[PDB]
Amino acid sequence: ALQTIINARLPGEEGLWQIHLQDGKISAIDAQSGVMPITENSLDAEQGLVIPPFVEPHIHLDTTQTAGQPNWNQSGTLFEGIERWAERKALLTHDDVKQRAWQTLKWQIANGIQHVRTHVDVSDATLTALKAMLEVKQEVAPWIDLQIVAFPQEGILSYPNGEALLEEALRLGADVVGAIPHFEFTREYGVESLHKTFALAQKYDRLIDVHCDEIDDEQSRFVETVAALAHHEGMGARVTASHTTAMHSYNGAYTSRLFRLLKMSGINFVANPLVNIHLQGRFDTYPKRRGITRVKEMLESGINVCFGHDDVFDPWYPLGTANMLQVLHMGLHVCQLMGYGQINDGLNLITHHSARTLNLQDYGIAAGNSANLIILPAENGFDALRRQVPVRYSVRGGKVIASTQPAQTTVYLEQPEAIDYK
Amino acid sequence: ALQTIINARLPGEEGLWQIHLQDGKISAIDAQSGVMPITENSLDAEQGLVIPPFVEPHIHLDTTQTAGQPNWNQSGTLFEGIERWAERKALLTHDDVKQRAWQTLKWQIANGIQHVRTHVDVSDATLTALKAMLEVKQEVAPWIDLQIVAFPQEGILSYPNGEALLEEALRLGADVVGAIPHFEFTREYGVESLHKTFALAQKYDRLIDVHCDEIDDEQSRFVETVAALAHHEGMGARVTASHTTAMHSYNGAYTSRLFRLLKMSGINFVANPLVNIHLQGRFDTYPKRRGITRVKEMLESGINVCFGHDDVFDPWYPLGTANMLQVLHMGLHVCQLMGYGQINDGLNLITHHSARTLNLQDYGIAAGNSANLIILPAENGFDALRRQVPVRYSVRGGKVIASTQPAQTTVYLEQPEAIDYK
Ligand SMILES: C[C@H](O)COCC(COC[C@@H](C)O)(COC[C@@H](C)O)COC[C@@H](C)O
Numbered sequence: 001a002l003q004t005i006i007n008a009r010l011p012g013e014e015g016l017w018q019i020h021l022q023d024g025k026i027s028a029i030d031a032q033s034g035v036m037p038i039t040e041n042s043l044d045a046e047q048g049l050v051i052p053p054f055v056e057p058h059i060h061l062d063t064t065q066t067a068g069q070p071n072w073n074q075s076g077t078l079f080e081g082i083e084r085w086a087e088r089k090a091l092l093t094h095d096d097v098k099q100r101a102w103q104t105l106k107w108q109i110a111n112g113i114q115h116v117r118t119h120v121d122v123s124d125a126t127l128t129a130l131k132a133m134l135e136v137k138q139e140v141a142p143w144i145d146l147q148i149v150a151f152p153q154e155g156i157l158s159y160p161n162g163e164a165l166l167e168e169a170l171r172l173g174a175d176v177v178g179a180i181p182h183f184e185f186t187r188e189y190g191v192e193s194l195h196k197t198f199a200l201a202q203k204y205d206r207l208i209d210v211h212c213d214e215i216d217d218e219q220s221r222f223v224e225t226v227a228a229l230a231h232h233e234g235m236g237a238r239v240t241a242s243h244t245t246a247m248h249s250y251n252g253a254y255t256s257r258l259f260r261l262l263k264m265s266g267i268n269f270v271a272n273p274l275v276n277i278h279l280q281g282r283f284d285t286y287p288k289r290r291g292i293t294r295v296k297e298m299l300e301s302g303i304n305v306c307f308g309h310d311d312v313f314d315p316w317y318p319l320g321t322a323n324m325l326q327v328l329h330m331g332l333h334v335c336q337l338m339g340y341g342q343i344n345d346g347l348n349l350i351t352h353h354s355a356r357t358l359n360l361q362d363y364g365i366a367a368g369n370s371a372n373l374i375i376l377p378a379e380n381g382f383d384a385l386r387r388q389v390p391v392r393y394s395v396r397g398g399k400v401i402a403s404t405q406p407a408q409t410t411v412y413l414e415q416p417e418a419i420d421y422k
Numbered sequence: 423a424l425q426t427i428i429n430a431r432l433p434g435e436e437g438l439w440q441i442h443l444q445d446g447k448i449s450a451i452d453a454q455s456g457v458m459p460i461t462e463n464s465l466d467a468e469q470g471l472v473i474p475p476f477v478e479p480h481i482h483l484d485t486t487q488t489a490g491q492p493n494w495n496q497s498g499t500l501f502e503g504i505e506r507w508a509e510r511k512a513l514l515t516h517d518d519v520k521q522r523a524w525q526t527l528k529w530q531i532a533n534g535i536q537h538v539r540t541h542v543d544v545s546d547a548t549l550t551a552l553k554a555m556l557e558v559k560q561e562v563a564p565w566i567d568l569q570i571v572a573f574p575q576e577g578i579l580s581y582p583n584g585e586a587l588l589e590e591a592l593r594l595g596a597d598v599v600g601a602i603p604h605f606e607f608t609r610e611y612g613v614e615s616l617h618k619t620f621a622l623a624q625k626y627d628r629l630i631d632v633h634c635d636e637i638d639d640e641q642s643r644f645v646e647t648v649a650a651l652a653h654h655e656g657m658g659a660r661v662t663a664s665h666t667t668a669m670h671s672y673n674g675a676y677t678s679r680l681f682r683l684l685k686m687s688g689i690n691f692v693a694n695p696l697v698n699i700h701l702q703g704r705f706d707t708y709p710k711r712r713g714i715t716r717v718k719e720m721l722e723s724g725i726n727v728c729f730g731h732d733d734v735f736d737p738w739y740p741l742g743t744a745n746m747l748q749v750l751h752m753g754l755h756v757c758q759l760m761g762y763g764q765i766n767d768g769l770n771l772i773t774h775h776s777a778r779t780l781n782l783q784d785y786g787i788a789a790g791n792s793a794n795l796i797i798l799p800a801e802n803g804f805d806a807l808r809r810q811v812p813v814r815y816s817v818r819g820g821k822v823i824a825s826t827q828p829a830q831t832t833v834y835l836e837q838p839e840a841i842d843y844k
């Protein structure tokens with residue numbers, strides 16, 4: 001029964017802090033006069049940084065851990081990835097999906113992630129993975145709040161009974177409506193698919209998260225429809241456009257015009273740096289574009305943007321340990337957000353901005369909130385990112401649900417010396 | 423007195439292996455029939471991967487740890503970096519250089535790096551850093567074999583007494599002659615500077631490592647002169663072209679013509695992914711080029727290419743823990759070397775290929791070689807790279823010089839569970 005977290009640093013605050021817990025909530029946050037001694041019912045943050053939990057705003061738990069089954073994505077493209085997945089989707093079972101999803105979820109718990117939005121492919125007359133994931137959501141609830149997106153991987157209009165399958169997924173309980181307009185057979189299907197998506201979200205009162213313009217095509221502008229529909233319906237906060245990698249290739253004048261709408265609409269954006277750097281630029285020879293959306297410009301304009309991992313060992317990404325600091329590291333480099341302050345503030349892109357994207361209400365280190373928080377063995381955001389630190393403790397509802405004993409490195413010179421990389 | 427390494431995996435080999443040590447050398451390597459029990463005078467590799475030590479073919483130890491002093495590189499460009507460094511170079515002292523260099527060298531020892539090539543700026547009438555680094559080379563020799571490049575940061579022809587200073591650095595003992603032709607005032611100075619560099623290397627019998635075409639300028643083609651001069655003198659193995667980021671922007675026909683010469687010349691290439699992704703593409707708006715040299719194509723052509731870290735917390739790079747697996751991770755992503763086999767073989771880009779670049783003779787796990795080797799807590803190269811593992815043990819001359827006790831992660835679900843991310 002934890003009553004207190006002691007010796008904690010807080011981003012943008014001086015000195016150490018004590019965090020009081022009561023009935024699974026944060027009751028008070030008080031400055032310390034100095035380093036406090038450990039007491040019973042206290043958790044020692046050891047002068048580490050305390051932040052709300054990491055968020056994964058974009059992952060595919062139904063595809064996770066399937067890379068190479070039955071074939072590998074040779075070209076490393078989005079489009080071959082979808083073909084490889086279709087082969088694997090034909091082999092899906094209820095137990096297979098739950099086993100793989102739980103494998104990745106456990107890594108996420110270990111990595112201080114307590115909020116996860118997973119897309120699940122509902123281009124499947126059996127809805128096997130969707131129904132299994134609805135179960136996983138209930139099973140993992142003590143540790144992770146899981147959102148499920150009904151994601152029509154093969155299109156709403158371009159796949160047999162796609163719209164009916166999408167609606168059935170919502171009826172069954174999916175939290176978010178997805179779409180994939182750039183993968184529809186025609187631009188017209190793409191636009192119409194978004195109208196159907198927004199109509200479904202309003203009918204069932206659900207969130208929207210579109211795989212939007214994930215393609216190096218300067219003519220792929222489905223994002224303007226997503227934002228306009230959100231604005232018309234006054235539902236900006238409930239709407240996310242994921243990827244928008246085509247925006248990397250837009251001319252500047254169109255982008256400037258578009259940004260007015262993006263700001264007015266209030267929609268959210270997700271960039272997925274690990275996967276984007278791998279899948280984008282694949283049709284260039286040299287020079288090769290980076291292919292990540294306009295993260296720097298969005299931040300400058302006060303548009304909410306955040307980072308997801310997207311894929312863990314699957315047809316679209318052969319790596320991953322589901323680590324958000326690793327995602328952030330890649331994102332800061334590729335987006336050239338490399339000023340000291342930008343790097344230090346980077347934690348926001350995998351915490352607060354992502355919580356906003358998921359429309360979370362109970363999130364942040366503040367009195368009255370659930371005691372959901374993590375402790376990093378680092379002095380600040382810059383230090384955590386630079387040293388790629390693990391999560392020392394993850395606390396949920398005032399209980400410890402994960403812990404890492406950090407590695408210990410020693411060099412043997414004229415005498416043994418501990419190395420902290422500081 | 424270690425006599426044996428037991429329970430070791432070797433890249434591309436089946437089962438476990440025993441490595442016998444004698445007089446600081448590898449005496450024999452024998453297959454094991456099974457897991458062996460720990461014995462006195464034995465080091466247990468614990469079924470980890472054993473490889474020769476990591477190599478850092480390109481770092482700046484004279485600039486390391488100076489980021490923000492006295493000013494920050496605001497634009498994140500090569501050119502502003504040089505201006506910021508010039509301000510800091512004016513404040514250099516003998517003790518300052520040795521203290522900062524040793525700080526980074528210790529991180530490198532901790533990271534299993536036993537071979538390091540450092541560039542040192544010799545555009546300095548006092549040669550302060552160069553002379554200090556010659557001392558550091560002797561001091562660190564029990565742990566790292568350090569090569570020093572006399573690097574004329576501000577040009578050979580474009581800096582007062584540049585050529586005389588470069589020659590004095592060689593007379594004093596620098597192992598390698600540097601140059602920076604794309605930073606010289608004119609293309610003609612650039613070409614002439616390479617002639618002077620090669621003349622000096624032949625006069626003193628030294629290696630050559632040129633900062634070559636580190637610029638997003640499709641007309642920057644100094645690499646062809648470096649290769650042609652190497653070919654003419656028959657000295658390919660002794661010559662390295664670092665960066666060659668302009669090659670990212672060459673047309674394909676010129677590149678094809680050039681590659682014939684690059685192969686015939688036998689020169690080495692260094693790409694520096696962490697720094698290249700940060701400094702290159704800075705003059706693009708959108709789309710933005712990646713800016714790394716043609717690593718994939720070089721590998722396909724049998725041209726020796728490897729990865730360096732380049733900078734650790736300095737005017738050109740505000741991050742770093744001097745970790746080669748992190749460099750490799752960035753390189754595989756940006757160069758799109760993301761096939762399973764390519765990732766698994768990635769260790770070569772920070773071991774064997776780099777040893778060739780430094781012209782090393784005593785390197786590799788083979789009988790007769792010095793017992794210089796490291797142990798990774800991983801099953802193979804792919805696993806090591808994916809999980810970004812630390813170095814479990816670093817062995818040099820048959821003695822342990824560094825060790826890391828790996829982190830331990832536990833999640834508390836219905837019962838405590840250990841997480842290995844596998
Ligand atoms: C390691 C991992 O991949 C498997 O864990 C088993 C697990 C068992 O589910 C129990 C459920 C809540 O009723 C989840 O992890 C353990 C609990 C305590 O969190 C999921 O197994 C899926 C099968 C049964 O298809």
Ligand SMILES: C[C@H](O)COCC(COC[C@@H](C)O)(COC[C@@H](C)O)COC[C@@H](C)O
Pocket residue numbers: 413414415516517518520521522524525528561
């Ligand atoms: C932590 C680091 O930044 C400082 O270490 C001190 C160190 C002392 O050098 C001793 C020499 C071999 O004669 C090197 O590390 C310890 C030895 C045992 O390896 C270098 O200090 C530089 C000063 C003296 O300008």
Ligand SMILES: N[P@]1(=O)C=CNC(=O)N1
Pocket residue numbers: 060078153180211214275310311316
């Ligand atoms: N890269 P990603 O987000 C993963 C799966 N399917 C997609 O269409 N895109």
Ligand SMILES: N[P@]1(=O)C=CNC(=O)N1
Pocket residue numbers: 482500575602633636697732733738
């Ligand atoms: N990026 P880099 O290799 C580091 C220092 N000075 C340079 O000119 N280039």
Ligand SMILES: [Zn+2]
Pocket residue numbers: 094132135
């Ligand atoms: Zn079931």
Ligand SMILES: [Zn+2]
Pocket residue numbers: 058059060119211310
């Ligand atoms: Zn996705």
Ligand SMILES: [Zn+2]
Pocket residue numbers: 516554557
């Ligand atoms: Zn001295």
Ligand SMILES: [Zn+2]
Pocket residue numbers: 480481482541633732
């Ligand atoms: Zn350099």
